[PDB]
Design an enzyme around this catalytic site. Structure first.
Site, PDB file in Angstrom:
ATOM      1  N   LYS A  11      59.066  22.271  74.466  1.00  0.00           N
ATOM      2  CA  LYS A  11      58.748  23.274  73.460  1.00  0.00           C
ATOM      3  C   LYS A  11      58.535  24.632  74.115  1.00  0.00           C
ATOM      4  O   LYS A  11      58.994  25.650  73.601  1.00  0.00           O
ATOM      5  CB  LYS A  11      57.506  22.879  72.657  1.00  0.00           C
ATOM      6  CG  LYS A  11      57.655  21.609  71.834  1.00  0.00           C
ATOM      7  CD  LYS A  11      56.347  21.081  71.269  1.00  0.00           C
ATOM      8  CE  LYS A  11      56.413  19.606  70.973  1.00  0.00           C
ATOM      9  NZ  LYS A  11      55.125  19.105  70.496  1.00  0.00           N
TER      10      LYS A  11
ATOM     11  N   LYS B 170      47.009  13.242  82.690  1.00  0.00           N
ATOM     12  CA  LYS B 170      47.569  14.592  82.406  1.00  0.00           C
ATOM     13  C   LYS B 170      46.824  15.672  83.205  1.00  0.00           C
ATOM     14  O   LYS B 170      47.334  16.816  83.267  1.00  0.00           O
ATOM     15  CB  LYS B 170      47.498  14.895  80.907  1.00  0.00           C
ATOM     16  CG  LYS B 170      48.391  14.040  80.019  1.00  0.00           C
ATOM     17  CD  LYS B 170      48.043  14.171  78.546  1.00  0.00           C
ATOM     18  CE  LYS B 170      48.783  13.209  77.637  1.00  0.00           C
ATOM     19  NZ  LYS B 170      50.182  13.634  77.422  1.00  0.00           N
TER      20      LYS B 170
ATOM     21  N   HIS C 113      57.669   3.714  75.761  1.00  0.00           N
ATOM     22  CA  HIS C 113      57.125   5.089  75.923  1.00  0.00           C
ATOM     23  C   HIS C 113      56.118   5.197  77.071  1.00  0.00           C
ATOM     24  O   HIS C 113      55.637   6.303  77.306  1.00  0.00           O
ATOM     25  CB  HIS C 113      56.479   5.563  74.622  1.00  0.00           C
ATOM     26  CG  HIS C 113      57.430   5.680  73.485  1.00  0.00           C
ATOM     27  ND1 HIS C 113      58.060   6.869  73.190  1.00  0.00           N
ATOM     28  CD2 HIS C 113      57.841   4.773  72.567  1.00  0.00           C
ATOM     29  CE1 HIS C 113      58.832   6.695  72.139  1.00  0.00           C
ATOM     30  NE2 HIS C 113      58.723   5.413  71.740  1.00  0.00           N
TER      31      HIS C 113
ATOM     32  N   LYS D 153      47.791  19.508  75.061  1.00  0.00           N
ATOM     33  CA  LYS D 153      48.188  18.078  75.004  1.00  0.00           C
ATOM     34  C   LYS D 153      46.910  17.266  74.828  1.00  0.00           C
ATOM     35  O   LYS D 153      45.811  17.816  75.063  1.00  0.00           O
ATOM     36  CB  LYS D 153      48.919  17.653  76.276  1.00  0.00           C
ATOM     37  CG  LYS D 153      48.198  18.004  77.562  1.00  0.00           C
ATOM     38  CD  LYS D 153      49.043  17.808  78.811  1.00  0.00           C
ATOM     39  CE  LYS D 153      50.127  18.849  79.024  1.00  0.00           C
ATOM     40  NZ  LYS D 153      51.486  18.348  78.694  1.00  0.00           N
ATOM     41  N   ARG D 154      47.042  16.001  74.447  1.00  0.00           N
ATOM     42  CA  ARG D 154      45.868  15.113  74.339  1.00  0.00           C
ATOM     43  C   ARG D 154      45.122  15.181  75.675  1.00  0.00           C
ATOM     44  O   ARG D 154      45.789  15.329  76.733  1.00  0.00           O
ATOM     45  CB  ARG D 154      46.315  13.709  73.920  1.00  0.00           C
ATOM     46  CG  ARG D 154      46.761  13.626  72.464  1.00  0.00           C
ATOM     47  CD  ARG D 154      45.608  13.911  71.511  1.00  0.00           C
ATOM     48  NE  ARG D 154      44.547  12.913  71.625  1.00  0.00           N
ATOM     49  CZ  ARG D 154      44.436  11.828  70.863  1.00  0.00           C
ATOM     50  NH1 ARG D 154      45.293  11.591  69.881  1.00  0.00           N
ATOM     51  NH2 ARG D 154      43.444  10.982  71.075  1.00  0.00           N
TER      52      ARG D 154
ATOM     53  N   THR E 168      56.985  16.165  75.779  1.00  0.00           N
ATOM     54  CA  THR E 168      57.812  16.962  74.839  1.00  0.00           C
ATOM     55  C   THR E 168      57.226  18.351  74.638  1.00  0.00           C
ATOM     56  O   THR E 168      58.021  19.237  74.286  1.00  0.00           O
ATOM     57  CB  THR E 168      58.033  16.210  73.531  1.00  0.00           C
ATOM     58  OG1 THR E 168      56.753  15.927  72.980  1.00  0.00           O
ATOM     59  CG2 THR E 168      58.862  14.960  73.752  1.00  0.00           C
TER      60      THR E 168
HETATM   61  O1  LIG Z   1      58.166   9.561  73.997  1.00  0.00           O
HETATM   62  C1  LIG Z   1      57.143  10.277  73.296  1.00  0.00           C
HETATM   63  C2  LIG Z   1      55.876  10.431  74.114  1.00  0.00           C
HETATM   64  O2  LIG Z   1      55.171   9.181  74.012  1.00  0.00           O
HETATM   65  C3  LIG Z   1      53.905   9.192  74.674  1.00  0.00           C
HETATM   66  C4  LIG Z   1      53.199   7.900  74.367  1.00  0.00           C
HETATM   67  C5  LIG Z   1      53.274   6.736  75.052  1.00  0.00           C
HETATM   68  N1  LIG Z   1      52.480   5.843  74.422  1.00  0.00           N
HETATM   69  C6  LIG Z   1      51.934   6.468  73.350  1.00  0.00           C
HETATM   70  C7  LIG Z   1      51.007   5.852  72.396  1.00  0.00           C
HETATM   71  C8  LIG Z   1      50.550   4.554  72.585  1.00  0.00           C
HETATM   72  C9  LIG Z   1      49.669   3.977  71.687  1.00  0.00           C
HETATM   73  C10 LIG Z   1      49.238   4.682  70.588  1.00  0.00           C
HETATM   74  C11 LIG Z   1      49.691   5.965  70.384  1.00  0.00           C
HETATM   75  C12 LIG Z   1      50.572   6.548  71.276  1.00  0.00           C
HETATM   76  N2  LIG Z   1      52.366   7.725  73.304  1.00  0.00           N
HETATM   77  C13 LIG Z   1      54.104   9.416  76.175  1.00  0.00           C
HETATM   78  O3  LIG Z   1      52.831   9.442  76.829  1.00  0.00           O
HETATM   79  C14 LIG Z   1      54.862  10.728  76.411  1.00  0.00           C
HETATM   80  O4  LIG Z   1      55.193  10.887  77.797  1.00  0.00           O
HETATM   81  C15 LIG Z   1      56.143  10.771  75.590  1.00  0.00           C
HETATM   82  O5  LIG Z   1      56.729  12.072  75.674  1.00  0.00           O
HETATM   83  C1  LIG Z   2      54.535  18.165  71.141  1.00  0.00           C
HETATM   84  C2  LIG Z   2      53.132  17.796  70.888  1.00  0.00           C
HETATM   85  C3  LIG Z   2      52.424  16.893  71.705  1.00  0.00           C
HETATM   86  C4  LIG Z   2      53.013  16.255  72.936  1.00  0.00           C
HETATM   87  O1  LIG Z   2      52.756  17.156  74.055  1.00  0.00           O
HETATM   88  P1  LIG Z   2      52.796  16.647  75.581  1.00  0.00           P
HETATM   89  O2  LIG Z   2      52.604  17.883  76.427  1.00  0.00           O
HETATM   90  O3  LIG Z   2      54.180  16.028  75.725  1.00  0.00           O
HETATM   91  O4  LIG Z   2      51.628  15.663  75.690  1.00  0.00           O
HETATM   92  C5  LIG Z   2      51.118  16.626  71.400  1.00  0.00           C
HETATM   93  N1  LIG Z   2      50.494  17.158  70.334  1.00  0.00           N
HETATM   94  C6  LIG Z   2      51.140  18.003  69.535  1.00  0.00           C
HETATM   95  C7  LIG Z   2      50.403  18.587  68.377  1.00  0.00           C
HETATM   96  C8  LIG Z   2      52.468  18.357  69.787  1.00  0.00           C
HETATM   97  O5  LIG Z   2      53.079  19.225  68.932  1.00  0.00           O
END
Ligand SMILES: OC[C@H]1O[C@@H](c2c[nH]c(-c3ccccc3)n2)[C@H](O)[C@@H](O)[C@@H]1O
Ligand SMILES: *Cc1c(COP(=O)(O)O)cnc(C)c1O
Ligand SMILES: OC[C@H]1O[C@@H](c2c[nH]c(-c3ccccc3)n2)[C@H](O)[C@@H](O)[C@@H]1O
Ligand SMILES: *Cc1c(COP(=O)(O)O)cnc(C)c1O
EC number: 2.4.1.1
Lengths: 810, 810
Positions: free
Chosen positions: A654, A548, A351, A542-543, A650
């Site tokens: 949406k 980002k 990921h 997003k986070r 993702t």
């Molecule tokens: O594939 C699902 C999404 O995965 C995210 C991700 C990577 N890595 C992590 C993580 C890593 C450690 C602990 C929690 C989360 N989360 C990517 O940053 C997105 O680009 C992608 O859309």
């Molecule tokens: C879909 C979703 C994300 C992922 O969003 P990105 O723009 O791909 O970082 C994060 N948080 C929530 C609550 C979501 O529903």
């Protein structure tokens, strides 16, 4: 009311009402004269849950009869959100329940709002797991989600004086009606101990026992009567544990801490023992369960014909050495046979390429906690490197780079390397990301085993992310092309023939305005803020991360503000700029960005010259249930990661599905989204991956941009001098210093192209008809980004199973 | 089958069966092909619980309409045992449920055995609370049990190599279907802080907040359709608690520890902070609830007309300063008015005269944890001592003795003194105990306020302790005199006219033999031991204590063994000597007595010369559900406490009701039991209270007894030389040394009278007809020892409410 919410038959409504009153009386032990809205929500949840039970029992039954190949999705995260409305959608109960609750004098929408989000995830990765379970059930796969029942999910975010404060997400306080405890399927998990070598092989002895107790949550497919299981493990101490007396009982907490709390880091690695315990806990209990189920049908040749294990990142990578340990130490298979079974069983989804997110566990940690797993990892490494040596003789450098063991002051295991060695398939999560894995971090592994490397572009479930969150849009689509698209999202292409239909243009634009009115009112009610609903809704949710580039958005916002102050009496397209997201509690820079966003809001939102032309809102506690509200309300989606950093995203999908235009970089799935819609229907700007590489070879000098762009210089001068922090002039010095000297994500390099591209967005918004026609071209080509497509591809190209859209009997 | 188990109507049985299958399907999510006996137990529990709900809702409803005076029973202990059979008995469902389960091919008795004991108590005190709630519901009093929902109750006892091992009583593992969580009635409890004095009085500030969440358990009355509530509080942390991030979440455990575990000391005081937190936690949450309910009807003059608070020992004594704090600091009543309300509201039950059991909290503890309560305690003390000074001018000694504050190296609060000062009524729990309170520990308090001091002799509920545990006996009684006696136990006197009836003598003796066969088989099945069911069942079951003199019993057992070995070929009445009970984990001497009992068993039970003539059994894990099995099987009840140490006892009453003869001292309720039955129908031996006093004035020399009784000398020589511990000759040196030099309970002083009296028991057992006639005279006069009598007396003489036997509507 609306057709896609199903029928409200007289029989059906009568039965829902008598069962609602039955649960209120017997289940909740309340009379109507003392029931709170919370009681009414619970009575409805128990009534809808009753409709799942027969279907759940028959589905698990059917999988025993038919004995299909079983998919195990292992994740540390399942970001489920609320279950009530999703359950009604998938069982076609929504209008019946609305009618039933309406006739008892209750508003179902008001009761829906009482349900706590199951926030057992951080963001994209956790939510992808939740969309996957939904699609797996919808495509009739014998699929099981396995994870951890955290007592505390992702923390609730409060803003205090513009700063993020964290508080514990006590999501189980009032009970979870969706879960079923199965204390009868409790399994032991072992930690610490040492390894004895005997005549009959290695033995893991003197271990500490933690019990894993499973909780089952139903996963209903879309109107196919399939209900799959999400099994989440809870840590329990054994009763002889620590067994002066009182202290021994209180010390049970040390063992149960394993399942207490979700680690709240998005796309970042924290090497803590407790995190490693969580990873082994879920893997050890899950594999015992997988093997128990397999044995109820000595011969493991057929294991990979009956079992697929998908690893959601490296977080459950210990499934590989654990499966070997069970097959070798306990089942007494020879190494080579056990390894064949393991590789044909396991597949690994990567990921991220961000180095700070890659799991590299110190050896001293594994040595103490999992001494046998470390012996097996060393053995895997030796046999793996012997194959590299034979394929690339003399390439000692390659041996060092590909090693599962990294040398250094502290030795580390590279869990990604372990996953590639031990898996028959390694996939990225968007085409550009998968290409980057083969060109860069996994180039060596690709050259050894090209056949392992696949792409599976991410998707979102159109059930939650359209029907559920945006019924108005789902309905106007269903008026023209019917309901089939909800389980076959490619059918949305049929909407391209309505791109010049006046009625449809009117209806698409009316739904968006209704969603904006509804969101604007939600803001006033729950957070006393007054937004102009005629303004363009510019949304970045997003986070909070540097990669980002919320900070790039901040620079645009301050540019719009400075342009208004320069020429106060000139027309600008009004904007509500909404930014939302959680920072990881230890991520200082992410916490500073939140403070800057709210600091900008304090200046901009209280300038009389600005009026309702520019508003900056920080959306507090961004989570799945807030995404369901704000994404349908959005006009512009902000997907502005530095090219090559956002593996997929993702959120981007949406918003595309929900009638927002995208301003974004050619990063992650943005590239496939622009390809599907046409580049002319997308607001693409900034460096490509190739351009970032060129800048990196030359060297990124942020000073060059500051010296050449007066508008940018003015913003940096404002930040430094305390224009946005009058009481603390130096508050944002860390942000300026990073942007000028230490910016890994090249914010200034994309500033000029971003602002120019934002001007093109404003220009198109002045022409509502052409804005909406471009929206239709986006919605109509969003079908590829259904997780049903993604899962069908996982199933055919990795797991070796055929999806099905055929109903089970009711 | 039997009449007192109620009707099995065709309609009733059909409805129980369809509801059993409904719960199995919907509640448990099981098909019949995977259900375990545990699933079937749960389906039955949910089905019976459904019959409580309407009655529970209507009873609480009725108490709102009628607004009667409300009784609050505050206890740290409720020793409830199993709920399923008790619920069926009180709702007359038992035969219907037997029939319903029988027709589904299940044995209800087998499902009953799966239910965990709610072991939220240590022994007599906790079990008296449970018998009281039952009688309060049966007598239609608007009564609430308030306590703590301990996650871990009294530890499970394992014997390993004849030693007690403790393991955690995880009674909630599988869920509690009887409780209903009420997270909506959660209340804050405060700890630590400091006191600010302002213009508007004292203010308790900077406190630590723990949340008290209530769980409600229904308490059904006997066939009157009344269902009262037992409310148990659980400790929860607030969500901003400790709020790096992870550690803060894990540290929530520190606050929740308050409700984690029952302190396992019977009749002993351990001055630990955590115990003090438990005491305040239950008092603080309960009083907020009492006051909230009172205010839903400014004027506290009427508080004591609407509220009675019974204190179960000193454990909830802080209710007195807490009520003052609420009335003075928060409601702004003047001191004198608040004190009047407090005294007319509160009443104190004393349960012991043993100095090591009396609660004396160090001042430094109260100073840190409850600074305001200590200020109020000091103020109570000053005003109290000013009344003593005025009544007894110049008696400075009296002032020192009566002070709530004890001087010494560490100052302590005497919580008993606080309870007497702050209560309108102080009662002991048997006539001799109440007389001892007025002559000794509370003589000074008696001389000041003679009117406060009452007796309320203890009782046992004849529902659990006859109908439930001994249906055969209940039935043969019901054949002769009908069913009325179950709620009016005095009616058992009508049995004196059957003392010469041959048929009744036969039936009483047949039931006892059936109970012995059933208990002997239970021993073989669950603990592979082979007892002669024709032998006299000599049973001593109670907590392991020096004052209860299990050691005296041991000396008798070893005497019988030595007499057999001396004259092997002489006839003796065969005996199964059964001793059972838990030792407090830190009570070294109690743990040594268990080891001696099992050591005697190892010698006696494996001597071929002894044969089946003498068997010594240690009954493992003595608890409420084992009492229900062994008490109906017993011939001889052992109640052999040193005169003046056993405040009442309640085991004694259980055995009297169930057809055992009593060998006992004139201690506690033994005295009233012999008075009711006639002394000639009781095996009374040993020192009276007066004789113990004389020996104490002269000085207890154990050597005198050792020198004068050869049989006793021989036993002490056997213990010392390792006859009972061949591998460790000195194992029992601590026991010998205590008996010879440090015996507070004068075991040797009662040895000769005990052995002679045990010979009279053996002689009567040889004449079955006269044994049974004496049994009938005991059963027939056991009616005084119904807790219905006890509660009617509390109600009329303390609480000022009239009991009622009238049905509520169904
Ligand atoms: O594939 C699902 C999404 O995965 C995210 C991700 C990577 N890595 C992590 C993580 C890593 C450690 C602990 C929690 C989360 N989360 C990517 O940053 C997105 O680009 C992608 O859309
Ligand atoms: C879909 C979703 C994300 C992922 O969003 P990105 O723009 O791909 O970082 C994060 N948080 C929530 C609550 C979501 O529903
Ligand atoms: O009144 C109920 C029974 O109460 C017992 C008691 C006193 N004291 C305690 C205790 C004290 C502290 C912690 C737990 C229990 N328990 C008496 O020992 C019996 O004689 C009597 O029958
Ligand atoms: C009744 C009872 C007691 C009290 O017995 P005593 O002989 O009065 O000490 C103790 N434990 C249990 C389980 C009981 O049922």
């Amino acid at each position: 009311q609306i057709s896609v919410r199903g029928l409200a038959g007289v029989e059906n409504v009568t039965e829902l009402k008598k069962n609602f009153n039955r649960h209120l009386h017997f289940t909740l032990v309340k009379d109507r004269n003392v029931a709170t809205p919370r009681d009414y929500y619970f009575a409805l949840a128990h009534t809808v849950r009753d409709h799942l039970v027969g279907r759940w029992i028959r589905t698990q039954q059917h999988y025993y009869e038919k004995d299909p190949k079983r998919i195990y999705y292992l994740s540390l995260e399942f970001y489920m959100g609320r279950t009530l409305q999703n359950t009604m959608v998938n069982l076609a109960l929504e209008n019946a329940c609305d009618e039933a609750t309406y006739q008892l004098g209750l508003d179902m929408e008001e009761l829906e709002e009482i349900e706590e989000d199951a926030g057992l995830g951080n963001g994209g990765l956790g939510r992808l797991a939740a969309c996957f379970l939904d699609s797996m059930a919808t495509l009739g796969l014998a699929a099981y989600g396995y994870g951890i029942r955290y007592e505390f999910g992702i923390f609730n975010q409060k803003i205090c004086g513009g700063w993020q404060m964290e508080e514990a997400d006590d999501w189980l306080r009032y009970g979870n009606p969706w879960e079923k405890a199965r204390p009868e399927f409790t399994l032991p998990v072992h930690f610490y101990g040492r390894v004895e070598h005997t005549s009959q092989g290695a033995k893991w002895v003197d271990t500490q026992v933690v019990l894993a107790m499973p909780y089952d949550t139903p996963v209903p497919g879309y109107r196919n009567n399939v209900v799959n299981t999400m099994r989440l493990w809870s840590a329990k101490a054994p009763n002889d544990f620590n067994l002066g007396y009182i202290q021994a009982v209180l010390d049970r907490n040390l063992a149960e801490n394993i399942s207490r709390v979700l680690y709240p880091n998005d796309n970042f690695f924290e090497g803590k023992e407790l995190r490693l315990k969580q990873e082994y806990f879920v893997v050890a209990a899950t594999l015992q369960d997988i093997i128990r189920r397999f044995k109820s049908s000595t011969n493991f040749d057929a294991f990979p014909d009956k079992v697929a294990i998908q690893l959601n990142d490296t977080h459950p990578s210990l499934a590989i050495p654990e499966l070997m340990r069970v097959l070798v130490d306990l089942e007494r298979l020879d190494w080579d046979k056990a390894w064949e079974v393991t590789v044909k069983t396991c597949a690994y989804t990567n990921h991220t390429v961000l180095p700070e997110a890659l799991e590299r566990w110190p050896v001293h940690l594994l040595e103490t906690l999992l001494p046998r797993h470390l012996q097996i990892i060393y053995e895997i490494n030796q046999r793996f490197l012997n194959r590299v040596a034979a394929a690339f003789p003399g390439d000692v450098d390659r041996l060092r780079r590909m090693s599962l063991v990294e040398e250094g002051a502290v030795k580390r295991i590279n869990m990604a390397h372990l996953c590639i060695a031990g898996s028959h398939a390694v996939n990225g999560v968007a085409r550009i990301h998968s290409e980057i894995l083969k060109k860069t971090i996994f180039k060596d592994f690709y050259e050894l085993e090209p056949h392992k490397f696949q792409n599976k572009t991410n998707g979102i479930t159109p059930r939650r992310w359209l029907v559920l969150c945006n019924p108005g849009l789902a309905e106007i689509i269903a008026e023209r092309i019917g309901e089939e698209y909800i389980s076959d999202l490619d059918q949305l292409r049929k909407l391209l023939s309505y791109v010049d239909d006046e009625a449809f243009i009117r209806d698409v634009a009316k739904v968006k305005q209704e969603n904006k009115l509804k969101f604007a009112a939600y803001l006033e009610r729950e957070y006393k803020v007054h937004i102009n609903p005629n303004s363009l809704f510019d949304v970045q949710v997003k986070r909070i991360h540097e990669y980002k580039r919320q900070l790039l958005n901040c620079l645009h916002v301050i540019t719009l503000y400075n342009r208004i102050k320069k020429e106060p009496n000139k027309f600008v397209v009004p904007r509500t700029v909404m930014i939302g997201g959680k920072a990881a509690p230890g991520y200082h820079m992410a916490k500073m960005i939140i403070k800057l966003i709210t600091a900008i809001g304090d200046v901009v939102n209280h300038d009389p010259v600005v009026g309702d032309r520019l508003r900056v809102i920080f959306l507090e506690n961004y989570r799945v249930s807030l995404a369901e509200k704000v994404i349908p309300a959005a006009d512009l989606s902000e997907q502005i990661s530095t090219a090559g950093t956002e593996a997929s995203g993702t959120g981007n999908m949406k918003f595309m599905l929900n009638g927002a235009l995208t301003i974004g970089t050619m990063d992650g799935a943005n590239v496939e989204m622009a390809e599907e819609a046409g580049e002319e229907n997308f607001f693409i700007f900034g460096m490509r991956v190739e351009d970032v590489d060129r800048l990196d070879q030359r060297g990124y000098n942020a000073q060059e941009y500051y010296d050449r762009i007066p508008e940018l210089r003015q913003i940096i001068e404002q930040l430094s001098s305390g224009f946005f922090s009058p009481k603390q002039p130096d508050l944002f010095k860390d942000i300026v210093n990073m942007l000028m000297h230490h910016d890994r994500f090249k914010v200034f390099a994309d500033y000029e192209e971003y602002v120019k591209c934002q001007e093109r967005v404003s220009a198109l918004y002045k022409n509502p008809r052409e804005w909406t026609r471009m929206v239709i071209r986006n919605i109509a080509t969003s079908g590829k980004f259904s997780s049903d497509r993604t899962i069908a591809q996982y199933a055919r190209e990795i797991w070796g199973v055929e999806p099905s859209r055929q109903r089970l009997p009711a």
